[PDB]
Amino acid sequence: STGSATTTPIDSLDDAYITPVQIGTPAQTLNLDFDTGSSDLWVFSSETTASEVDGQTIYTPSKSTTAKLLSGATWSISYGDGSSSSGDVYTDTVSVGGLTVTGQAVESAKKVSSSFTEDSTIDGLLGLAFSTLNTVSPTQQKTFFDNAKASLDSPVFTADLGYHAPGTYNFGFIDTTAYTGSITYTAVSTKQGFWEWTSTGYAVGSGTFKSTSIDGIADTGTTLLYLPATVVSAYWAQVSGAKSSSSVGGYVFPCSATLPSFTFGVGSARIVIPGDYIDFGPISTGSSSCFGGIQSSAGIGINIFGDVALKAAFVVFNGATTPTLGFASK
Numbered sequence: 145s146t147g148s149a150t151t152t153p154i155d156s157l158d159d160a161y162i163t164p165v166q167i168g169t170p171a172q173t174l175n176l177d178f179d180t181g182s183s184d185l186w187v188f189s190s191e192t193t194a195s196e197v198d199g200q201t202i203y204t205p206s207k208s209t210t211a212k213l214l215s216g217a218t219w220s221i222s223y224g225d226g227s228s229s230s231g232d233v234y235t236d237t238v239s240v241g242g243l244t245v246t247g248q249a250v251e252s253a254k255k256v257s258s259s260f261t262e263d264s265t266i267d268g269l270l271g272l273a274f275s276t277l278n279t280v281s282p283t284q285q286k287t288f289f290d291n292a293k294a295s296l297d298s299p300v301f302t303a304d305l306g307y308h309a310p311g312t313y314n315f316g317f318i319d320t321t322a323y324t325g326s327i328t329y330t331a332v333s334t335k336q337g338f339w340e341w342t343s344t345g346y347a348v349g350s351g352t353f354k355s356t357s358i359d360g361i362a363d364t365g366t367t368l369l370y371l372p373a374t375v376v377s378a379y380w381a382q383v384s385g386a387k388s389s390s391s392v393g394g395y396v397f398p399c400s401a402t403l404p405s406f407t408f409g410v411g412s413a414r415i416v417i418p419g420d421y422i423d424f425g426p427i428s429t430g431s432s433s434c435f436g437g438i439q440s441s442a443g444i445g446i447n448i449f450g451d452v453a454l455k456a457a458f459v460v461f462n463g464a465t466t467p468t469l470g471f472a473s474k
């Protein structure tokens with residue numbers, strides 16, 4: 145089997161991407177944030193505290209003939225941005241672009257934190273990291289990909305995110321028309337539960353490529369590119385007037401600047417992020433100070449290859465018995 149679904153930016157800045165998911169019988173369609181850096185599938189629901197729902201589409205398990213409460217199971221998650229959610233758990237039928245899993249754990253939110261309430265475009269998360277990070281207690285649950293894996297033609301999914309445009313998630317096959325050149329595969333460590341790999345270096349604009357190992361995670365759920373402070377300083381030094389602002393929370397730059405590209409290494413291959421991909425616009429409406437798309441990972445504890453980097457590539461999440469990651473230019 146295979147599946148394919150279109151993923152769409154939530155706004156004009158690519159602040160996140162949403163993908164339609166069918167849940168239950170008859171189907172209930174929710175727009176979820178596919179997140180290769182977490183492992184819970186959770187949704188806004190008829191159980192969510194009413195004051196914490198503001199425009200999201202909700203899952204109502206009592207209207208689904210295939211929903212069954214998973215007795216005694218609860219879940220509670222806290223994310224890297226300080227947001228959180230928690231609730232109870234049903235099993236139900238879940239499909240993504242034609243690919244169906246029966247008995248998927250659907251974690252129904254009873255509480256969500258303010259940043260989820262305030263974002264009316266995201267109805268939940270669909271985690272695609274390793275199931276070792278799933279938070280369901282006392283019986284841990286599997287991700288949608290882990291449940292589908294054995295049925296798929298090949299045990300893979302791919303991410304092809306667009307810059308200011310829609311893109312595609314495919315399950316079970318590699319679309320060889322979607323990239324240029326060849327796919328370079330690189331080794332993965334699953335010890336922390338993430339798609340964790342090692343980049344071979346970087347360059348700023350047309351400058352000299354620096355060979356240096358950069359450990360980090362491939363994360364569709366993170367908007368920006370978070371890298372070591374030495375690397376990020378080298379980038380922004382090439383933008384006149386750019387500086388790190390403690391009060392805003394990162395590097396900002398004059399909106400009048402033209403940004404250089406940023407290249408990262410995958411083995412001997414090279415992925416080029418165009419400068420325009422690194423512009424996230426005015427810090428507040430009407431401001432001439434703009435927020436940068438490359439930021440320091442200091443204080444996170446981990447480097448994160450988020451959407452700013454992933455949308456410049458065709459990315460293969462290979463879930464063979466020894467997982468790997470593949471990157472191609474496009």
Ligand SMILES: CC(C)CN(C[C@@H](O)[C@H](Cc1ccccc1)NC(=O)O[C@H]1CCOC1)S(=O)(=O)c1ccc(N)cc1
Nearest residue numbers: 179180181182183222223224225277363365366367446
């Ligand atoms: C709800 C999603 C988006 C949560 N984030 C992305 C996730 O992939 C996030 C990535 C991450 C991993 C490790 C350390 C720090 C961050 N994983 C995460 O925290 O995993 C926890 C829960 C399970 O085990 C560990 S985010 O980083 O908070 C974020 C928030 C807002 C924006 N605009 C962009 C990113």
